[PDB]
Scaffold this motif. Structure first.
Motif, PDB file in Angstrom:
ATOM      1  N   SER A 160       0.803  -1.227   0.000  1.00  0.00           N
ATOM      2  CA  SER A 160       0.000   0.000   0.000  1.00  0.00           C
ATOM      3  C   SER A 160       0.833   1.273   0.000  1.00  0.00           C
ATOM      4  O   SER A 160       0.495   2.251  -0.667  1.00  0.00           O
ATOM      5  CB  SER A 160      -0.922   0.022   1.219  1.00  0.00           C
ATOM      6  N   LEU A 161       1.927   1.256   0.747  1.00  0.00           N
ATOM      7  CA  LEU A 161       2.781   2.429   0.839  1.00  0.00           C
ATOM      8  C   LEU A 161       3.568   2.745  -0.431  1.00  0.00           C
ATOM      9  O   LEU A 161       3.989   3.886  -0.643  1.00  0.00           O
ATOM     10  CB  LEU A 161       3.729   2.278   2.026  1.00  0.00           C
ATOM     11  N   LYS A 212       6.586   1.552  -1.384  1.00  0.00           N
ATOM     12  CA  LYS A 212       7.952   1.807  -0.982  1.00  0.00           C
ATOM     13  C   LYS A 212       8.846   0.594  -1.242  1.00  0.00           C
ATOM     14  O   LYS A 212       8.354  -0.532  -1.381  1.00  0.00           O
ATOM     15  CB  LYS A 212       7.997   2.208   0.495  1.00  0.00           C
ATOM     16  N   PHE A 250       2.207 -13.038   3.480  1.00  0.00           N
ATOM     17  CA  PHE A 250       2.690 -12.090   4.484  1.00  0.00           C
ATOM     18  C   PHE A 250       3.650 -11.069   3.827  1.00  0.00           C
ATOM     19  O   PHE A 250       4.822 -11.384   3.534  1.00  0.00           O
ATOM     20  CB  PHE A 250       3.422 -12.853   5.594  1.00  0.00           C
ATOM     21  N   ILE A 251       3.157  -9.854   3.593  1.00  0.00           N
ATOM     22  CA  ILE A 251       3.977  -8.818   2.971  1.00  0.00           C
ATOM     23  C   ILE A 251       4.572  -7.870   4.008  1.00  0.00           C
ATOM     24  O   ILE A 251       3.856  -7.115   4.666  1.00  0.00           O
ATOM     25  CB  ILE A 251       3.169  -8.002   1.952  1.00  0.00           C
ATOM     26  N   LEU A 252       5.894  -7.924   4.150  1.00  0.00           N
ATOM     27  CA  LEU A 252       6.614  -7.108   5.126  1.00  0.00           C
ATOM     28  C   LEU A 252       7.417  -6.015   4.449  1.00  0.00           C
ATOM     29  O   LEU A 252       7.809  -6.149   3.296  1.00  0.00           O
ATOM     30  CB  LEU A 252       7.551  -7.999   5.953  1.00  0.00           C
ATOM     31  N   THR A 253       7.665  -4.934   5.181  1.00  0.00           N
ATOM     32  CA  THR A 253       8.416  -3.804   4.655  1.00  0.00           C
ATOM     33  C   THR A 253       9.563  -3.366   5.578  1.00  0.00           C
ATOM     34  O   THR A 253       9.959  -4.100   6.486  1.00  0.00           O
ATOM     35  CB  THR A 253       7.477  -2.594   4.406  1.00  0.00           C
ATOM     36  N   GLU A 254      10.106  -2.175   5.337  1.00  0.00           N
ATOM     37  CA  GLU A 254      11.197  -1.630   6.148  1.00  0.00           C
ATOM     38  C   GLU A 254      12.345  -2.624   6.255  1.00  0.00           C
ATOM     39  O   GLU A 254      12.243  -3.632   6.956  1.00  0.00           O
ATOM     40  CB  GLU A 254      10.685  -1.284   7.552  1.00  0.00           C
ATOM     41  N   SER A 268      14.898  -2.921   7.978  1.00  0.00           N
ATOM     42  CA  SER A 268      15.208  -3.339   9.335  1.00  0.00           C
ATOM     43  C   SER A 268      14.467  -4.607   9.655  1.00  0.00           C
ATOM     44  O   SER A 268      15.066  -5.628   9.992  1.00  0.00           O
ATOM     45  CB  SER A 268      14.795  -2.268  10.336  1.00  0.00           C
ATOM     46  N   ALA A 269      13.145  -4.525   9.562  1.00  0.00           N
ATOM     47  CA  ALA A 269      12.281  -5.666   9.834  1.00  0.00           C
ATOM     48  C   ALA A 269      12.637  -6.808   8.873  1.00  0.00           C
ATOM     49  O   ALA A 269      12.974  -7.918   9.290  1.00  0.00           O
ATOM     50  CB  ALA A 269      10.811  -5.254   9.661  1.00  0.00           C
ATOM     51  N   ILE A 276      15.890  -8.540   9.707  1.00  0.00           N
ATOM     52  CA  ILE A 276      15.734  -9.258  10.973  1.00  0.00           C
ATOM     53  C   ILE A 276      14.824 -10.476  10.821  1.00  0.00           C
ATOM     54  O   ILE A 276      15.124 -11.556  11.327  1.00  0.00           O
ATOM     55  CB  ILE A 276      15.156  -8.322  12.076  1.00  0.00           C
ATOM     56  N   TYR A 277      13.702 -10.297  10.139  1.00  0.00           N
ATOM     57  CA  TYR A 277      12.778 -11.398   9.912  1.00  0.00           C
ATOM     58  C   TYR A 277      13.551 -12.443   9.103  1.00  0.00           C
ATOM     59  O   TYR A 277      13.442 -13.650   9.342  1.00  0.00           O
ATOM     60  CB  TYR A 277      11.569 -10.893   9.119  1.00  0.00           C
ATOM     61  N   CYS A 330      16.133 -14.177  11.283  1.00  0.00           N
ATOM     62  CA  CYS A 330      15.406 -15.127  12.124  1.00  0.00           C
ATOM     63  C   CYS A 330      14.970 -16.372  11.351  1.00  0.00           C
ATOM     64  O   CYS A 330      15.570 -17.449  11.501  1.00  0.00           O
ATOM     65  CB  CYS A 330      14.179 -14.450  12.737  1.00  0.00           C
ATOM     66  N   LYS A 331      13.938 -16.197  10.528  1.00  0.00           N
ATOM     67  CA  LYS A 331      13.399 -17.285   9.728  1.00  0.00           C
ATOM     68  C   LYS A 331      14.477 -18.137   9.093  1.00  0.00           C
ATOM     69  O   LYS A 331      14.303 -19.347   8.944  1.00  0.00           O
ATOM     70  CB  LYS A 331      12.490 -16.762   8.613  1.00  0.00           C
ATOM     71  N   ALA A 343      18.378   5.585  11.697  1.00  0.00           N
ATOM     72  CA  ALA A 343      17.170   6.104  11.059  1.00  0.00           C
ATOM     73  C   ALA A 343      16.929   7.569  11.363  1.00  0.00           C
ATOM     74  O   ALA A 343      16.211   8.243  10.633  1.00  0.00           O
ATOM     75  CB  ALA A 343      15.956   5.291  11.479  1.00  0.00           C
TER      76      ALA A 343
END
Ligand SMILES: N[C@@H](CCC(=O)N[C@@H](CSCc1cccc2ccccc12)C(=O)NCC(=O)O)C(=O)O
Ligand SMILES: N[C@@H](CCC(=O)N[C@@H](CSCc1cccc2ccccc12)C(=O)NCC(=O)O)C(=O)O
Lengths: 244, 244
Positions: free
Chosen positions: B50-51, B53, B62-66, B68-69, B72-73, B76-77, B103
């Motif tokens: 939506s953004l 970016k 599962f749509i992730l952004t940034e 950083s996340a 890290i995700y 992890c995963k 940031a």
């Protein structure tokens, strides 16, 4: 333990961190640092946090900064409720994503009114109307993305239950408010989420977490504002100088 | 798995994320999104993030952004090496603190030269000299705090070994560089850390991670720059508009 927490409740991140700790009741030695005065530049404070910023957490001889880290380290070391800072992959990511976007679009954008209204004139500096307008239209612009992009139909920015994402958000957004900006006016989705968060957290907390900034416009007029030291003057001058 | 990674290697966070994944070799479906063109605003892309970016990671539904996340995700995963994103309390905090400060002071401050030099003029807009100067003096100001406040005598911002903090940092700082700004000139502490990180990572990676932006100033002159779509135009107009 008694790890010391140096802050100034007029500083939004400072607030956010202070609400977590107490609400999750954590032994803390609240060491006030007068920002408006310039205590966060006192040679003595710099021997604790080179950057001279608030809030900074002194645990042991390990001095940490940035509320995000502080809160998280807090949550971790103090095994606070899971809902706060989840352990679920998808979960946590959603907070790390917001806290990533929060620092871009919210942080530094929702504290400008205080400089336009209080801190700025404190040192004789008047901020340009354009920057004022530009910033406000810049605010709702954030408020919308925060309103429907993150909040959406769900109860929280970072998901289903209260999370540091909401503690950070609502705190940052409390500054323009306490100044006279009712950002939840035409925003029910927003007015509610906030009130939802507030509900959970508790009046007594929020009723004291803020206060300082709620009265801030007063001391202002009644000139109950300390005269910033030259070191603070500088940083006040820099800040106002990066107002787009 | 084959989770898709939509990015544009001209976007510093996009790079940082792309270096981690490959360097730690993670199955990724690199879905290019032309920022300069405005593909990140194509109704079709907006049905993913939506953004609008970059970068945004589409794992499952599962749509992730940034970044950083994302990183890290990812870490992890994909149980990547510990040194990357530590598990140690003190450890992790140090990253969470830098990425918190990164940031604030690095992000948005070290990508202005490209707007002053390429993207801005791309749509006929010229940035004011002052903003130009102001920003550069604002850069080293960051470079110093990064040089001695985080780096110090140690080998890395976030501690002893390479970490996302270093991946993020060096990438963000590669833009001014690739444009003609040699930020490591009078900074051996800095020139070294970067080269140290580079060493570790590997030439072939860094030699391709960048490229796009390294050539960027040329396509610029030879007008090999696509004409931004109205939607992109707006965003470039906004960006240039928040240059202090
Ligand atoms: N990402 C970190 C940054 C903290 C921060 O910027 N802190 C600000 C204070 S909050 C904002 C704030 C509130 C009320 C009065 C103030 C008077 C002068 C300057 C800022 C004021 C700071 O340290 N600023 C000092 C500096 O940067 O030199 C975080 O989230 O904690
Ligand atoms: N915190 C997140 C934010 C990512 C971001 O801001 N991405 C920028 C691109 S980077 C900067 C960038 C590099 C090269 C060409 C560009 C042409 C137009 C606009 C930005 C450009 C973005 O999505 N911007 C789009 C938007 O915000 O609408 C992260 O670190 O990933």
């Amino acid at each position: 333990m008694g790890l010391e927490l140096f802050l100034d409740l007029v500083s939004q991140p400072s607030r956010a961190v202070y609400i977590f700790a107490k609400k999750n009741g954590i032994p803390l030695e609240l060491r006030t640092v007068d920002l408006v005065k310039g205590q966060h530049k006192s040679k003595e404070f710099l021997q604790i946090n080179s950057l001279g910023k608030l809030p900074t957490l002194k645990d042991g001889d390990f001095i940490l900064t940035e509320s995000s880290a502080i809160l998280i380290y807090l949550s971790c070391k103090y095994q606070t409720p899971d809902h706060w800072y989840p352990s679920d992959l998808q979960a946590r990511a959603r907070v790390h994503e917001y806290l990533g976007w929060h620092a871009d679009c919210i942080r530094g954008t929702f504290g400008i009114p205080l400089w336009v209204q209080v801190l700025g004139p404190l040192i004789g500096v008047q901020v340009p109307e354009e920057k004022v307008e530009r910033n406000r239209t810049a605010m709702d612009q954030a408020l919308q993305w925060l309103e429907d992009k993150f909040l959406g139909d769900r109860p929280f920015l970072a998901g289903q239950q209260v999370t540091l994402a909401d503690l950070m958000a609502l705190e940052e957004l409390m500054q323009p408010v306490a100044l006279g900006y009712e950002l939840f006016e035409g925003r029910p989705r927003l007015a509610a989420w906030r009130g939802r968060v507030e509900a959970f957290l508790g009046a007594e907390l929020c009723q004291e977490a803020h206060s300082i900034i709620l009265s801030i416009l007063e001391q202002a007029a009644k000139k109950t504002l300390p005269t910033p030291s030259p070191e603070a003057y500088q940083a006040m001058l820099l800040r106002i100088a990066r107002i787009p």
